Amino acid sequence: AECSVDIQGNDQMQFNTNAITVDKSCKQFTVNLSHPGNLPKNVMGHNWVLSTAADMQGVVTDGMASGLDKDYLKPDDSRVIAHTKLIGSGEKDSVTFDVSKLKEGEQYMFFCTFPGHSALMKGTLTLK
Ligand SMILES: [Zn+2]
């Protein structure tokens, strides 16, 4: 929609989009995450995490190492540009970040860091 996107994470470990475009005129960009379904956070948790395509693996490995209680994200990880909390079904969370944190010609990825989900739950984010 205008400088924002609503995205869903379901019980089959799927996001309903796999490509996000952010227009350079946006001062800010907002992602609104929801989780349709019935499974709880500890079985099917999903968060929306954004980093460069280069940093994603490091973010995923260290996130797995943080624990459920840490939302499977390394606290104050410098490589995460923006992220929601980890949510279960029926829950909701949003994040607004400044678009100046992204630069032209850099590849970005969004993904879920919940153990085992990033292999299937990821997509690209692009500044146009
Ligand atoms: Zn997930």
Beta strands 92-98; 28-34: pairing state: antiparallel
Q: How far is the centre of ligand 1, averaged over its atoms, from the C-alpha of 43 (Å)?
A: 9
CB 125 within 8 A of CB 20: yes
Q: What angle do CA 19, 24, 29 make, to 5 degrees?
A: 65
How far is 128 from 122, CA to CA, in rounded Å?
Answer: 19
At 109 the three-state DSSP class reads strand
How crowded is the C-beta side of 83, counted as CA atoms within 13 Å? Answer: 29
CB 83 within 8 A of CB 75: no
The CA-to-CA distance between both ends of the chain, in Å, stands at 15
How far is 8 from 92, CA to CA, in rounded Å?
Answer: 9
CB 127 within 8 A of CB 71: no
Q: How far is the centre of ligand 1, averaged over its atoms, from the C-alpha of 86 (Å)?
A: 8
How far is 45 from 3, CA to CA, in rounded Å?
Answer: 26
CATH architecture of the domain with range 1-128: Sandwich (2.60)
Resolution in A: 2.1
Domain ranges in the chain are: 1-128
- C-alpha distance from residue 94 to each of 5, 35, 61, 110 (Å): 10, 12, 24, 14
CB 71 within 8 A of CB 18: no
Q: How far is the centre of ligand 1, averaged over its atoms, from the C-alpha of 24 (Å)?
A: 29
Binding-site sequence positions: 46, 112, 117, 121
How far is 28 from 85, CA to CA, in rounded Å?
Answer: 19
Binding-site sequence positions for Cu cation: 46, 112, 117, 121
Q: How far is CA 19 from the centre of its chain?
A: 12
